[PDB]
Design a protein around this ligand. Structure first.
Ligand SMILES: CCCCCCCCCCCCCCCCCC(=O)OC[C@H](COP(=O)([O-])OCC(O)COP(=O)([O-])OC[C@@H](COC(=O)CCCCCCCCCCCCCCCCC)OC(=O)CCCCCCCCCCCCCCCCC)OC(=O)CCCCCCCCCCCCCCCCC
Ligand SMILES: CCCCCCCCCCCCCCCCCC(=O)OC[C@H](COP(=O)([O-])OCC(O)COP(=O)([O-])OC[C@@H](COC(=O)CCCCCCCCCCCCCCCCC)OC(=O)CCCCCCCCCCCCCCCCC)OC(=O)CCCCCCCCCCCCCCCCC
Ligand SMILES: CCCCCCCCCCCCCCCC(=O)O[C@H](COC(=O)CCCCCCC[C@@H](C)CCCCCCCCC)COP(=O)(O)O[C@H]1[C@H](O)[C@H](O)[C@@H](O)[C@@H](O)[C@@H]1O
Ligand SMILES: CCCCCCCC/C=C\CCCCCCCC(=O)OC[C@H](COP(=O)(O)OCCN)OC(=O)CCCCCCCCCCCCCCC
Ligand SMILES: CCCCCCCCCCCCCCCC(=O)O
Ligand SMILES: CCCCCCCCCCCCCCCC(=O)O
Ligand code: FES
Lengths: 74, 377, 28, 52
């Protein structure tokens, strides 16, 4: 799924992962970080850390998906 | 090659022929010291010799140190404890040094004197030649077809049935000695016979049994009754279910009972005296509103996650902590798990005092104590 | 990787409860 | 498991296996007592044939 210009040694071994796997992986990782807010803990600093990391992951996935959908990123 | 011309081959030619038979061609092999009579060869020979000699002298040191060093354990803070502490490091030093030096000498001999070679072997892998594959397939098919088992369905069906039945019977008669019902009532109780997982040493046995909270003195009479004023506020105690009929460790049956109560996995109880200035902060569990005796609460010392002793009492936070997986229960909220992988509260033991004033258990745990299982709740 | 469930029998209370009575043990 | 004897306990034509018991070994109620009595009864050179 890659070209010699992108991955020089593409003929030699497995060198492409479909972007769907990465996109759903990011969404699932964000969902896991969010769902970890349900549990047993008095404090709420960890909830904000989870929310921030989930936001960063969702932002990265959204930007990558948007740029592949518009043509800039391939 | 014939015997006559084999008789007239040099050793190098014979090695070449032998390698060629096996599929191996040594395309390079040259002596390590082509130039005779140099000082560098002498130096390398003496280096290998010195490494092997160090190995020999270290083996001798191993023999001598093992035989003659003072090895017997020496008590704390006495003379001869330094030599005892050095005993085992000296065995390790001598043994490892000897064998490591021998290995180094062997590596150096290989790298410096054994001629460097580059041999090439043919793999001959993948599919077998068609003659071998066809002959082996024909042999197997001929066995199966001459057996005639295919055209005899009654014999094949009977053979399958019999072998399967014998295998099933043997497997059952093999594993069956290990299979134990965990719910066979074997433990007496003031309500009949009950399963082990439903009971502990705190379970009363004759409907009015006085079970004392006994501290472990860690000594003849390792357990003793204790009074509520024997715990200062903010202090923690590990108590065990001890009855009058258990004894004091003198007689052998008394020691057996005391051992069996000290080794009960669900026996230990954590007894904590809350400071009164914090007794307003106590939130009580439904159905356990009357299990504490004033400032003294009693909980199980068995974590509800995986059964480790949650035995770290932080008084200024009233937090029970289990070191196995870092669970935190709030002792002010009926030992509710506030952190970690624990999701169930620690059981609370009802306690009171008897006529003499000694702390006793006011009944049994109102739930199973240790880690959860299928049949819980 | 799923959600959490509280134990059905682990609720809190508001009743303060009575102080435990002095204990007496049957002879056997 | 160990009690003393008297010359009249055994009779002419009888035999008794006897063991060396001291009066500090005890009778086995305490744990040290049972350890000591086990040491008495599990010593390979201890038993003695006593014949009248
Ligand atoms: C505080 C002290 C600091 C000290 C440190 C100092 C350092 C300084 C820090 C500041 C540095 C400033 C900038 C430095 C220079 C960087 C710029 C640069 O050089 O490049 C230009 C840089 C290039 O970026 P780009 O233009 O976007 O192009 C992207 C590439 O083309 C990408 O091309 P692509 O399309 O091929 O991308 C591939 C894929 C990226 O691929 C991935 O990353 C996925 C990783 C894992 C793959 C999946 C797992 C593998 C499969 C196994 C399982 C199979 C099922 O894309 C994505 O999916 C991205 C989203 C990631 C989602 C994955 C998250 C979870 C993965 C799932 C794993 C789950 C774990 C399992 C463990 C088990 C748990 C129980 O341009 C930018 O600067 C963009 C800015 C960044 C955007 C941020 C916007 C978000 C909002 C703010 C945050
Ligand atoms: C500590 C790490 C950072 C965390 C703190 C971050 C603070 C947040 C600041 C947010 C920045 C807002 C300003 C940019 C607005 C972005 C939209 C835009 O530009 O539209 C133009 C864009 C133009 O259209 P186009 O013609 O097709 O683009 C072609 C051009 O080449 C377009 O040019 P391009 O492809 O080259 O990309 C430009 C554009 C398009 O790319 C995107 O897709 C952006 C999408 C997300 C960007 C951030 C917005 C959400 C951030 C969440 C809050 C984080 C906190 O936006 C960006 O990528 C800029 C983001 C990174 C800028 C700085 C990168 C490195 C410098 C950082 C310094 C050192 C690092 C330390 C951090 C210091 C930060 C000050 O229109 C779009 O639709 C793009 C947006 C794609 C939407 C897909 C969904 C994205 C997921 C975001 C949802 C986040 C959830 C909200 C959080 C809720 C929780 C409370
Ligand atoms: C590849 C395996 C395929 C075959 C598996 C073997 C067949 C399984 C059943 C065993 C055959 C029955 C033999 C006796 C079993 C029997 O009838 O047990 C009764 C209650 O069984 C029952 O109703 C049925 C048992 C239900 C099976 C439950 C499955 C759990 C298994 C999968 C987990 C065990 C894994 C073992 C791994 C080994 C680990 C160690 C390396 C009540 O036990 P209990 O009243 O405590 O009495 C005890 C005497 O039974 C018993 O012999 C014993 O010798 C006595 O000491 C006595 O305690
Ligand atoms: C509400 C608003 C939220 C806004 C915030 C963030 C936006 C995030 C949305 C962003 C959308 C995220 C989902 C997505 O990306 O869906 C497309 C995939 C990528 O392929 P693509 O089309 O080429 O993407 C480039 C676009 N040219 O389609 C597929 O292939 C799916 C194929 C399915 C394969 C199965 C994958 C197995 C998953 C295993 C993971 C472990
Ligand atoms: C210091 C390490 C040296 C080890 C020995 C060097 C290589 C010798 C190879 C031995 C080949 C096998 C013995 C041949 C016997 C004939 O006769
Ligand atoms: C009732 C006992 C009969 C036992 C079986 C006798 C015949 C042996 C068969 C051996 C060959 C097995 C099949 C090899 C593959 C072919 O195809
Ligand atoms: S056994 Fe206590 S946290 Fe695991």
């Amino acid at each position: 799924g890659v070209d010699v210009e992108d991955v020089p040694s593409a003929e030699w071994g497995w060198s492409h992962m479909p972007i769907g796997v990465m996109h759903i992986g990011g969404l699932l990782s964000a969902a896991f970080l969010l769902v970890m807010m349900r549990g047993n803990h008095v404090g709420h600093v960890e909830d904000w850390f989870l929310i921030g990391f989930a936001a960063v992951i969702v932002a990265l996935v959204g930007r990558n998906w948007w740029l592949r959908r518009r043509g800039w990123i391939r | 090659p014939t015997d006559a011309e084999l008789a007239e081959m040099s050793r190098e030619e014979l090695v070449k022929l032998g390698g060629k038979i096996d599929g191996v061609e040594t395309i390079f092999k040259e002596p390590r010291w082509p130039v005779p009579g140099t000082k560098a060869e002498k130096r390398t020979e003496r280096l290998v010799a010195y490494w092997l000699m160090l190995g020999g002298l270290s083996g001798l040191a191993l023999l001598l140190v093992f035989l003659f060093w003072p090895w017997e354990y020496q008590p704390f803070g006495s003379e001869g404890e330094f030599l005892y502490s050095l005993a085992t490091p000296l065995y390790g030093l001598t043994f490892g040094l000897s064998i490591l030096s021998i290995g180094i000498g062997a590596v150096l001999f290989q790298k410096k004197f054994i001629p460097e070679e580059i041999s090439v072997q043919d793999r001959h892998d993948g599919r077998s030649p068609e003659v071998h594959r066809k002959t082996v397939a024909a042999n197997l098919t001929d066995a199966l077809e001459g057996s005639t088992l295919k055209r005899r369905k009654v014999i094949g069906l009977s053979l399958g049935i019999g072998l399967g039945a014998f295998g099933a019977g043997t497997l059952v008669a093999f594993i069956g000695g290990l299979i134990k019902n965990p719910w066979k009532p074997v433990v007496p109780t003031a309500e009949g016979k009950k399963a082990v997982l439903w009971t502990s040493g705190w379970t009363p046995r004759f409907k009015g049994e006085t079970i004392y909270l006994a501290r472990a003195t860690g000594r003849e009479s390792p357990f003793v009754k204790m009074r509520p004023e024997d715990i200062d506020a903010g202090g923690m105690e590990t108590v065990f279910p001890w009855r009058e009929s258990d004894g004091d460790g003198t007689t052998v049956e008394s020691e057996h009972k005391l051992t069996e109560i000290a080794m009960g996995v669900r026996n230990p109880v954590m007894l904590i005296r809350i400071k009164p200035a914090d007794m307003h902060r106590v939130i009580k569990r439904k159905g356990q509103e009357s299990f504490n005796f004033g400032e003294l609460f009693a909980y199980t010392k068995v974590c509800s996650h995986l059964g480790c002793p949650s035995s770290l009492y932080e008084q200024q936070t009233y937090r029970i902590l289990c070191p196995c997986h870092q669970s935190q229960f709030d002792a002010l909220e009926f030992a509710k798990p506030i952190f970690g992988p624990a999701a169930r509260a620690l059981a609370q033991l009802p306690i009171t005092i008897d006529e003499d004033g000694y702390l006793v258990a006011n009944g049994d745990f109102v739930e199973p104590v240790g880690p959860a299982f299928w049949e819980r709740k | 990787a799923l959600s959490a469930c509280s134990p059905p029998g682990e609720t809190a209370s508001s009743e303060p409860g009575t102080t435990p009575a002095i204990w007496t043990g049957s002879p056997s």
